[PDB]
């Protein structure tokens, strides 16, 4: 039994109606860790905010994640779909699921959801891709063919591997 550290990236198009062009949240069960976006600063607490190992994982993930959203914001605008554009238009949904590795070499699964229409996944374990159908596998093959973008996916994991494992051990344990 357990939990995995789950991060959720949301890349949309700006819109002075909803400017935020990217947002990410990583939780382990219910415990929030990270919450980024392109908006602004403050820093609020209600009781949590620290749990020391979270500030550790928080520090590790922040940039690699930020660069990923940056990557994906272009990866998506560059992409052709079936929908009619107005001034851009895509809506991406990414979800990395990192389970506790006691298990051999740290692995995660990155899930992509484009416009709620296209779905495909990346498995860090055996460096593989799966698509929901051939309509989705089309985009997938364009993306998987992007070396830097794939690297970012594996490296994000290789990098914050240990710190996420440590946070997972201490987590859900008081």
Swiss-Prot record:
Q: Does the keyword Repressor apply?
A: no
Q: State the name under which the record lists this protein.
A: Retinoic acid early-inducible protein 1-beta
- UniProt keyword list: Cell membrane, Disulfide bond, Glycoprotein, GPI-anchor, Lipoprotein, Membrane, Signal
All disulfide bonds of the chain are 7-26, 60-160
Query: Would you tell me the Gene Ontology cellular component terms?
Result: external side of plasma membrane; plasma membrane
The glycosylation sites annotated in the UniProt record are 8, 40, 53, 113, 126
By sequence similarity, the record places it as follows:
Belongs to the NKG2D ligand family.
The answer to whether keyword Signal applies is yes
Q: Where in the cell is it found?
A: Cell membrane
Instruction: Give the record's PTM text.
Output: Glycosylated.
Molecular-function annotations in GO = natural killer cell lectin-like receptor binding
Job of this protein: Acts as a ligand for KLRK1.
Expression induction per the record is: By retinoic acid.
The species is Mus musculus (Mouse)
Task: Say which residues of the entire protein are included here.
Answer: 31 to 204 of 253
Q: Which GO terms describe its biological process?
A: cellular response to exogenous dsRNA; cellular response to lipopolysaccharide; defense response to bacterium; positive regulation of immune response to tumor cell; positive regulation of macrophage activation; positive regulation of natural killer cell activation; positive regulation of nitric oxide biosynthetic process; positive regulation of type II interferon production
């Amino acid at each position: 039994d357990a939990h995995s550290l789950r991060c959720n990236l949301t890349i949309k198009d700006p819109t002075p109606a909803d400017p935020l062009w990217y947002e990410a949240k990583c939780f382990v069960g219910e415990i929030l860790i990270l919450h980024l976006s392109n908006i602004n600063k403050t820093m609020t607490s209600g009781d949590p905010g620290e749990t020391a190992n979270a500030t550790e994982v928080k520090k590790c993930l922040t940039q690699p994640l930020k660069n990923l959203c940056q990557k994906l914001r272009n990866k998506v605008s560059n992409t052709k779909v079936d929908t009619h554009k107005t001034n851009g238009y895509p809506h991406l949904q990414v979800t990395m699921i990192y389970p506790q590795s006691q298990g051999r070499t740290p692995s995660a699964t990155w899930e992509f959801n484009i416009s709620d229409s296209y779905f495909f996944t990346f498995y860090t374990e055996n460096m593989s891709w799966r698509s929901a159908n051939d309509e989705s596998g089309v985009i997938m093959n364009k993306w998987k063919d992007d070396g830097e973008f794939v690297k970012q996916l594996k490296f994000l994991i290789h990098e914050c591997s240990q710190k996420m494992d440590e946070f997972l051990k201490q987590s859900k344990e008081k």
